[PDB]
Amino acid sequence: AALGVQSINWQTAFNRQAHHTDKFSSQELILRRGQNFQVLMIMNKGLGSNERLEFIVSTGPYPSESAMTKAVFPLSNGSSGGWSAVLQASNGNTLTISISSPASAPIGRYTMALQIFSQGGISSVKLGTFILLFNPWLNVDSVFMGNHAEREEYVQEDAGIIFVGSTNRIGMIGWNFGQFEEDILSICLSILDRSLNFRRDAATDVASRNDPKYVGRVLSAMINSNDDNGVLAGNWSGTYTGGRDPRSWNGSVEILKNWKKSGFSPVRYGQCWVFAGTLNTALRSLGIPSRVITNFNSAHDTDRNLSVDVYYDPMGNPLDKGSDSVWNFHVWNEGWFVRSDLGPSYGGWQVLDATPQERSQGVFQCGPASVIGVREGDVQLNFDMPFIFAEVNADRITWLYDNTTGKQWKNSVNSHTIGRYISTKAVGSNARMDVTDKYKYPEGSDQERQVFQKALGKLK
């Protein structure tokens, strides 16, 4: 009899609890990276002195060691650094094994196989599959959120509140993120396998899934229909024929399900809060702690000058010249991660917007943008920091556009009408946190102007 596997006990319920994934409705093994899990492997015999067990884990359709999307690791007695399998105890035929993943491992669906070398033969069997997510309880993961209350809100809370309407008429709507409902984690994983990024280079897309900047920005693309047949099709016409009035959705679950079940065909119809709430499901499901931000008098600047320009022909007439507009409210998301590309001082909250307003490298996508960065006017940085600066802290200019000499001189500058009552749900309650002061310096002060100026000189 050659050394084989009789059966394996994944200790699913136990590992899910320790990995903080026990709430998803699923019989799968769901795990977080950088964190060991323990399995019991029942062999047909004892390990002999010369026989070798190799674990193999792969994710995605073109997996490879060099892209970090396949790993091969021996059952060992040692502390190793990558993927590793430690033999904790042998008890007759039964091996107690502690497996860990690196904290830099791509998130996704993985396959796990075991390759046995014994009697100058080789056997290879599939043990199973698991999902691996981002790990915000792990101090070295980029998505680390050390505060426990904040973590329960921004990861584990499946129900929320979005602020809506206009400065004079604030309202709030119930929103069921529903990340733990049946099939939803699975669907949110599907999303990543349907991006442009993936259609054009799957192997490299899947390798980039270790990075929340990358996952996060793909999601900002894929939650809208534009470009890629993503989840939701926006409609601001007023006419909601052939679908659901945006005001009639209560959460993300029906949306994401309807998307999957139609064969990844867009769902009709959404507006910004519907994009923000759906994106929030996706971000929380995958391990990126996130929340919903609403901005009243939100600028749509359409030419990267940090200002909303409604133009006036000299001698004082309005003109049709202008794409620049202002929404009563706009809603987007913030995701929590360090920014290794930017500097330690730019970590924390990063803006992500799935509403199709402006293109970015030719695609309806937006973010991530260091909130800290936007506030300090550091707008040369990746990604889309000019657009989002305008959103919360544009000036509003009036101009004089002479029809004849081409000269353009300013009538009046309004430096405070944009970006008001910026709001997100409280930790633990349904109270409104104001986070205006997190996005910009106080309106009508010095630093606020000298940072507007700093920012205006960083567009070049």
């Epitope: 024929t241 079940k261 064969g263």
Partner: antibody
Framework: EVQLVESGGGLVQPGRSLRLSCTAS????????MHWVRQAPGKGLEWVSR????????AYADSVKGRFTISRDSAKNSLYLQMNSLRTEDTALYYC???????????????WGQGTTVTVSS | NFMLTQPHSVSESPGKTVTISCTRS????????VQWYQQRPGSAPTIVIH?????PSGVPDRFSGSIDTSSNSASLTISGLKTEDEADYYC?????????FGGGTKLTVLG
């Protein structure tokens, strides 16, 4: 209540044409895909054709493709099936059905008409 | 392209529970929503389950739908059978173009 009323059925000869109509009431017609499904005496349901809410997406069973054309008319709240080059095997009860799904491209039949009978014989 | 296969017939006594399976020939059963319809002899079909497991307004909770990934099948379960439940039952799904019906199951309530 939703009502769907099919008409235009009858005895018709191989090779000829027949036009079925379905008038819809008690819901917003243009919000939904519509279908034709048929059923030969004592047999099962066979889906025939689907048209999307805005008529931009149409599909047909292979057994009828190139012979049957589906269409709809918003102002008349009506669905139609133009059946050309009929065959003895097209004999069936033809049902009109409203799709269940609003705003997504999934398909199910939430309401069905009583149907209109088509017999194909020379 | 796929087929949906149902059993030709099922039967049980009044008050008992019966299950009708619907197996998808290729592709995953949970890729696309499953509907179930009842058709009484000489009558138009009516829907009894939609979106795999949801019940239309006014369908008794004796009717339930399920999906079983491991057998690539959907199931319609009817508890507390009444003599009026005697009928043909059809499952239905689709791919992103074509609608597919199962071949139907005659449910007899044994008398």
């Amino acid at each position: 209540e939703v009502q769907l009323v099919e008409s235009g059925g009858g005895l018709v000869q191989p090779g000829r044409s027949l036009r079925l109509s379905c008038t819809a009431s008690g819901f917003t017609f243009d919000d939904y895909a519509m279908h034709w499904v048929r059923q030969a005496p004592g047999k099962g349901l066979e889906w025939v054709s689907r048209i999307s809410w805005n008529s931009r997406s149409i599909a047909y069973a292979d057994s009828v493709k190139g012979r049957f054309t589906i269409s709809r008319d918003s102002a008349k709240n009506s669905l139609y099936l133009q059946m050309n080059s009929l065959r003895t095997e097209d004999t069936a009860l033809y049902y009109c059905a409203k799709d269940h799904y609003l705003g997504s491209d999934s398909y199910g039949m939430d309401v069905w008409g009583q149907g209109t009978t088509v017999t194909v014989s020379s | 392209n796929f087929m949906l296969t149902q059993p030709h017939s099922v039967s049980e006594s009044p008050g008992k529970t019966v299950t009708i399976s619907c197996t998808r020939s290729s592709g995953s059963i949970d890729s696309n929503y499953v509907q179930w319809y009842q058709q009484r002899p000489g009558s138009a079909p009516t829907i009894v389950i939609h979106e795999d497991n949801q019940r239309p307004s006014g369908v008794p909770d004796r009717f339930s739908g399920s999906i079983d990934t491991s057998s690539n099948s959907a199931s319609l379960t009817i508890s507390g059978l009444k003599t009026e439940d005697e009928a043909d039952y059809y499952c239905q799904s689709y791919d992103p173009s074509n609608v597919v019906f199962g071949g139907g199951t005659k449910l007899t309530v044994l008398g």
